[PDB]
Structure 1
Amino acid sequence: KVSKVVCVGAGYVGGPTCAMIAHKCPHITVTVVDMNTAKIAEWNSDKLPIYEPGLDEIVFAARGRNLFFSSDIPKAIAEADLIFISVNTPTKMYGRGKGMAPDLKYVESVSRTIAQYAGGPKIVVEKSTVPVKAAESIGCILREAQKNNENLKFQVLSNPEFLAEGTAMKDLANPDRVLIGGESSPEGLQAVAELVRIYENWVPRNRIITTNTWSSELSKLVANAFLAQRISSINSISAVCEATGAEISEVAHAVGYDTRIGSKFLQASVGFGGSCFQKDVLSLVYLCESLNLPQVADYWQGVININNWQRRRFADKIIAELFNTVTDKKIAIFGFAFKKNTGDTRESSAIHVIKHLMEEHAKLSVYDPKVQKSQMLNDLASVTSAQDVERLITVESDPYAAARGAHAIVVLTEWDEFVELNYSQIHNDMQHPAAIFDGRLILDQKALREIGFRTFAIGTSPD
């Protein structure tokens, strides 16, 4: 029976996951470790290294009791009964599968430390949002360790995470499902049962799916791709609505009435972001190519092609509607995170849209309620340059200051705060005529028009 859980990786996955375990399992001790010593110190402070609604209350109530953050990875490894691995698998920027395949270097190095410091039987659980052959590389390394020293009985399991950032605590406390994969053997079934037993402290058995290792990873890979496909499908139709005088919001509403389709994840946008979806579909495309399934690869590649096309055509419409010139024009950007209720900016559509406007020599004032300032500048500099950010980018802590004197507003993240702003007062303090471009479909187009905006929105005909 597991009573000591360790997780290597104190990120958006590892942190929240362990916090919920400690919150729901009083008799389990949870220790989170990370190579980043400064990041662990933040987890132990009153300002956590990430923003998640409800995370502070959960962590502060468990930290020091049964939830711990340490930088002594070997000590945690040695004392664990079960060890989560939740580290990066950054995409390969060279070689085979360049720009498509994950690089497993971190997963393997952690596995070697586990082999080096386990000192006894361990259950090792790979937990990420895009697992593709990651558990197989852990098992490869661990099997050898057992082979070389039979005192180290290791069972490797696959338990991908399903949380969405911004709703992580709600998702972790009441998941639609829990997916666990392991080898079909006596020791494998026992290890799965002990992980199931942990989740059964708060997850009903009928929502826990157990299978083999590869099925678990493939199901996660396919599930993520299905979600991205819904977004790209409704986004592709948003262009049809603009061209024919229909409203994508009405089309999505009518489509969702079919219970066979479902009504969720039919919200058009400037394009999906996040560390999961693009990496996931490209990983599926790369997997299919390596299996000699070109037909399949082409099918799923369309989800990425539409996403890139949606971002590009949105930025182009901004420029075209401003008479093809934004040179030296101040433009306010509402939103930088890839979705609301998070400070995470990985693969945010705001990065690509702002870059396009920078290439037009616009001066951009960006506001986001939660994204760190240094994070925005590093993101923008890595796609352009440090100098380009210095001349063109201004970061504001107040949306009215960003809009003051601006020629245009661009909404890129669906923060609820952006709905409740005083757009009448904003219109008085902008340059005239004032334009606004809604890339998230959260604003009242008719009301903005009556205020006097030249107003535009994805999925609405520009006239």
Structure 2
Amino acid sequence: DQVFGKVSKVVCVGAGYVGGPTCAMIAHKCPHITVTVVDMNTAKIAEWNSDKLPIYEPGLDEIVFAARGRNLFFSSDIPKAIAEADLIFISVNTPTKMYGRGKGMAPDLKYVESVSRTIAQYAGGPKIVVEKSTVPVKAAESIGCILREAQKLKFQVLSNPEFLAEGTAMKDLANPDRVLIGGESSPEGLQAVAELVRIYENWVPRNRIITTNTWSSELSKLVANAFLAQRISSINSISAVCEATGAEISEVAHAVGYDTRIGSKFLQASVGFGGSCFQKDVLSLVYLCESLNLPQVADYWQGVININNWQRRRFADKIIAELFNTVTDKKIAIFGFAFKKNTGDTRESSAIHVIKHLMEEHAKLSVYDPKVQKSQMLNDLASVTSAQDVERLITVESDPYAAARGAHAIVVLTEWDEFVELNYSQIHNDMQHPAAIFDGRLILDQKALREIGFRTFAIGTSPDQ
């Protein structure tokens, strides 16, 4: 009684960082399947169809340009792709709600819903529908309900979470730690799961494909990200203890990370974690727990976010304090803006939030980042303050020496390699005196900077041994 047969036609709705690369891998490993990536952004589709792909990922040019026009297609004709597909990935944003119930915590399902309604309209036959972009738990229930309405057509909804990072996407897709698939505990559900497993089996060992119920798969994505962020918050909390006692956080992280049950990854203390994943997913899970009347669990995971914001705040406090509790019109140089090194991504960057704290104190801020666009920077800061306030307080530099010049303080907020072995003796010389340096990323040599004559601070080190 076979309702879903072998998939030969795959569509992904959403041509962004998740959808594009994932489809490309499918087309590359599965020459028998037609894969079409659709998006109503006709300019972005034109980019994927051009000689310069809209994202840079190592290995991706080779893949897309070999397959495009053969078994990989990029189109803006969404109804036609939907009508012809056997399996449809949904790869859209779930922006955080800005107002109302779950403000600042709940994912907004408007795009997911929009795609589901389009599939309902244009499907024509039985489809497997697959949640690829991060969703709140029970999103598949909402999708299911939208699709079931059109069955007056058979649909199964699967969860297949992404585990991609920027810069390593092709390696992450070609050699994943695991592939996770969740579906309905039902015969039709098992059939649909099996057809998606069959796709991945083309290139992924069966024992690295993990199949679960739909809710476990959706939950596992949030929880995995929560566990990672918890590691960072746990170490960052201990950084304050080190500061208070004369222990060293670099030394504790080493000793702790050598237990094989804990592991040595994600144990770098910092001014705090950033990016479009960690806070968003931890807050999604908090909101979920609140909504389930599990306030104890909610409070437990909120602590991850509490520590992160406390790290950022207490770091800025220390800058404000050491500058005599007064910084109106006073020049401070920020080294770094992007949420981590080696990107232009600013989403949830600790730098945005530390700078905001210093803008409150009316500081005059000179920002340098190797990669982030000037326009992006000024838009970011405006969104958390005002266009007026950044006009007043914010100068962006294309040079680190131009930022540090005549500043009372240096603050390193992104861990760029090029900040290590700047000419710090010269920086010292052209600063105000006494001169202060704050290392939020633990990349600088404390001993050397001390010898140069800086008042020098790092997270996780006591100021006086």
| Mapped contact 1:36–1:71 kept (Cα < 8 A) | yes
Structure 1 residue 73 displacement after superposition: 2.0
Task: Point out the more displaced range, 382-391 or 286-295.
Answer: 286-295
Change (3 A) 1:197 1:328: same
Per-residue displacement from partner, 1:197-239 (whole Å, max 9, x unpaired)? 2222332211110011111111222222111111111111000
Change (3 A) 1:197 1:446: farther
Task: Point out the more displaced range, 342-351 or 259-268.
Answer: 342-351
Structure 1 residue 352 displacement after superposition: 0.7
Matched, 1:91 2:88: no
Per-residue displacement from partner, 1:87-109 (whole Å, max 9, x unpaired)? 11122233322222122111111
Question: What is the CA–CA distance in structure 2 between the aligned matches of 1:52 and 1:165, rounded to whole Å?
Answer: 8
Question: What is the CA–CA distance in structure 1 between the aligned matches of 2:254 and 2:388, rounded to whole Å?
Answer: 45
TM-score (norm 2): 0.91
Task: Give the secondary-structure state (helix, strand or coil) at the position aligned to 1:42.
Answer: helix
Change (3 A) 1:171 1:404: farther
Change (3 A) 1:88 1:44: same
| Mapped contact 1:89–1:106 kept (Cα < 8 A) | yes
Structure 1 residue 57 displacement after superposition: 5.2
Structure 1 residue 390 displacement after superposition: 1.6
Structure 1 residue 46 displacement after superposition: 5.3
Question: What is the CA–CA distance in structure 2 between the aligned matches of 1:454 and 1:53, rounded to whole Å?
Answer: 42
Structure 1: 5+ residue stretches without partners:
none
Matched, 1:326 2:331: no
Change (3 A) 1:189 1:251: same
Task: Point out the more displaced range, 97-106 or 62-71.
Answer: 62-71
Question: What is the CA–CA distance in structure 1 between the aligned matches of 2:417 and 2:314, rounded to whole Å?
Answer: 25
Task: Give the secondary-structure state (helix, strand or coil) at the position aligned to 1:210.
Answer: strand
Per-residue displacement from partner, 1:126-180 (whole Å, max 9, x unpaired)? 0123542222211111122224xxxx22221101112233433332232211110
Change (3 A) 1:409 1:53: farther
Change (3 A) 1:62 1:391: farther
Matched, 1:105 2:110: yes
Task: Point out the more displaced range, 53-62 or 314-323.
Answer: 53-62
Structure 1 residue 349 displacement after superposition: 1.2
Question: What is the CA–CA distance in structure 1 between the aligned matches of 2:335 and 2:51, rounded to whole Å?
Answer: 28
Question: What is the CA–CA distance in structure 1 between the aligned matches of 2:363 and 2:50, rounded to whole Å?
Answer: 39
Structure 1 residue 56 displacement after superposition: 4.9
Question: What is the CA–CA distance in structure 1 between the aligned matches of 2:419 and 2:65, rounded to whole Å?
Answer: 30
Per-residue displacement from partner, 1:28-83 (whole Å, max 9, x unpaired)? 33332223333334444555545555555554554444444333222322232221
May I ask how many residue pairs the two structures share in their alignment?
A: 459
Question: What is the CA–CA distance in structure 1 between the aligned matches of 2:387 and 2:55, rounded to whole Å?
Answer: 25
| Mapped contact 2:337–2:368 kept (Cα < 8 A) | yes
Task: Point out the more displaced range, 296-305 or 195-204.
Answer: 195-204
Question: What is the CA–CA distance in structure 2 between the aligned matches of 1:359 and 1:48, rounded to whole Å?
Answer: 41
Structure 2: 5+ residue stretches without partners:
1-5
Question: What is the CA–CA distance in structure 1 between the aligned matches of 2:312 and 2:70, rounded to whole Å?
Answer: 46
Question: What is the CA–CA distance in structure 2 between the aligned matches of 1:419 and 1:21, rounded to whole Å?
Answer: 41
RMSD, matched Cα: 2.3
Question: What is the CA–CA distance in structure 2 between the aligned matches of 1:419 and 1:157, rounded to whole Å?
Answer: 47
Question: What is the CA–CA distance in structure 2 between the aligned matches of 1:137 and 1:345, rounded to whole Å?
Answer: 31
Kindly, what percent of the aligned residue pairs are identical? 100
Task: Point out the more displaced range, 382-391 or 169-178.
Answer: 169-178
Match of 2:46 among 28, 33, 41: 41
- Mapping for residues 174-185 of structure 1, pairs under 5 Å: 174-185=175-186
Per-residue displacement from partner, 1:295-318 (whole Å, max 9, x unpaired)? 211111111111111111111111
Task: Give the secondary-structure state (helix, strand or coil) at the position aligned to 1:188.
Answer: helix
TM-score (norm 1): 0.92
Per-residue displacement from partner, 1:319-354 (whole Å, max 9, x unpaired)? 112222222233222222222233222211111111
